[PDB]
Structure formats: C-alpha cells, structure tokens
Amino acid sequence: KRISNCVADYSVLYNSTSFSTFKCYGVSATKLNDLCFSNVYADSFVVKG
Amino acid sequence: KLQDVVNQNAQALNTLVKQLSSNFGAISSVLNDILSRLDPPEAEVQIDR
Numbered sequence: 001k002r003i004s005n006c007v008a009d010y011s012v013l014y015n016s017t018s019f020s021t022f023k024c025y026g027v028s029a030t031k032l033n034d035l036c037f038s039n040v041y042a043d044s045f046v047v048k049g
Numbered sequence: 050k051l052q053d054v055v056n057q058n059a060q061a062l063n064t065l066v067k068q069l070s071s072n073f074g075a076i077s078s079v080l081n082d083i084l085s086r087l088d089p090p091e092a093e094v095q096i097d098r
C-alpha cells in the first residue's frame with residue numbers, strides 16, 4: 001500500500017507495543033522522525049514465527 | 050606542448066574530483082548520508098571501504 005502526503009512520527013509507531021520481530025535495514029531506526037520519505041510502501045500480511 | 054602541460058593537469062584534477070562521486074561497494078557515494086542514514090557500528094563498515 002502506498003502512503004503519501006502526511007507526517008509520520010517514528011516514536012509513536014515504535015513505542016506502540018513491543019514488536020516481536022522489529023528491524024529496520026537500510027537505515028538506523030531512530031532518526032525516522034527527522035527524515036523525509038517519498039512514496040513509502042507498507043506490505044501487510046500474516047506469517048508464522 | 051605548452052598547452053599540453055595544462056591539459057594534462059586538467060585531466061588529472063578532473064579525474065581526481067570526479068571519482069569521488071562513486072560508491073566503492075557502498076550503498077551511496079556520499080559520506081554524510083551514510084553517517085546520517087546508519088549508526089556507527091556498520092556505518093564504519095561502509096566508510097572504511
């Protein structure tokens with residue numbers, strides 16, 4: 001799903017719950033709050049552990 | 050041959066400046082992003098290259 005034209009607070013997404021498998025690959029996870037992103041995508045699904 | 054010397058140093062400087070704008074096995078050719086897009090523990094891994 002495409003996400004566009006909005007403000008994305010990293011902290012609130014990061015501190016919502018203790019995500020079991022959480023890792024950001026190409027970037028250090030913290031500084032999203034300062035960054036700008038062009039056409040981020042979200043890949044939603046369900047998998048087993 | 051007089052203009053040859055200046056032409057030679059011209060290519061020299063041109064290549065010297067030009068080849069920086071090139072990743073060397075790096076995600077990007079520009080340092081300040083790699084510094085600002087990853088943390089030191091693996092940012093070092095790229096800046097060393």
Ligand SMILES: *[C@@H]1O[C@H](CO)[C@@H](O)[C@H](O)[C@H]1NC(C)=O
Nearest residue numbers: 011012013014015016017018
């Ligand atoms: C729903 O959103 C709230 C608000 O941040 C969050 O605390 C909660 O963890 C979210 N529930 C999820 C992601 O299942």
